[PDB]
Design a protein around this ligand. Structure first.
Ligand SMILES: CCCc1cc(-n2c(=O)[nH]c3ccccc32)c(O)cc1O
Length: 208
């Protein structure tokens, strides 16, 4: 059972802009995804202060970076609060309609694509380097779901019965053929040190 949805016009326009605009500084996609993981981890940390049972689905708060050269994928895994099915469908928990508007207005006032995260739509910077993105998530209040999109105006949502996660979100980037540098250990280390050196959770870079 696969459900197919149309992106709202503003989000489809944002995705087309990220895919078709000439912009060389693509590495910022990783900072944006680590930042989103950190926000998810802050949220489960805060909720767990008053209700420690929210950590029954996993006490470890961390971020893993998993490159796979054979599949040409870079996966970012976190054990944050996760997302419900309703949040996935509602632009992955983002204010994507108003955020896209504010980002578009900023771009005309002197901003560049690297400032995308300031408008709450940093997730979509994944399309600077990925031809397809799969988001697997598990929130304490819902079942495990997989969201997927190759852009083109639509996304799918399905239940995910393979590999239960416990709690959190997994973003799988199916890299564009000319963006395989982001699977190289030295390149990932460089980007984490440059843009994410002070994140408040352990970031483990897996090796092959
Ligand atoms: C999948 C869209 C963006 C994104 C979102 C999340 N995320 C969640 O899964 N729950 C969140 C609650 C607050 C902030 C970000 C959250 C994440 O853990 C990683 C991630 O890359």
């Amino acid at each position: 059972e696969v459900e197919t949805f149309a992106f709202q016009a503003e989000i489809a326009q944002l995705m087309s802009l990220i895919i078709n605009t000439f912009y060389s500084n693509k590495e910022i996609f990783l900072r944006e995804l680590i930042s989103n993981s950190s926000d998810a981890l802050d949220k489960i940390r805060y909720e767990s202060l008053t209700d420690p049972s929210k950590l029954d689905s996993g006490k470890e708060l961390h971020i893993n970076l998993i490159p796979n050269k054979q599949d040409r994928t870079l996966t970012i895994v976190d054990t944050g609060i996760g997302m419900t099915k309703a949040d996935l469908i509602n632009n992955l928990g983002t204010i994507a309609k108003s955020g896209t508007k504010a980002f578009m207005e900023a771009l005309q006032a002197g901003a560049d694509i690297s400032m995308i995260g300031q408008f709450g739509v940093g997730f979509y910077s994944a399309y600077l380097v990925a031809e397809k993105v799969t988001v697997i998530t598990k929130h304490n209040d819902d079942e495990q779901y997989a969201w997927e999109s190759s852009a083109g105006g639509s996304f799918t949502v399905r239940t995910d019965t393979g590999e239960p996660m416990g709690r959190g979100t997994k973003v799988i980037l199916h890299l564009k053929e000319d963006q395989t540098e982001y699977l190289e250990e030295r390149r990932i280390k460089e980007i984490v040190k440059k843009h994410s050196q002070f994140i408040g959770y352990p970031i483990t870079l897996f090796v092959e």
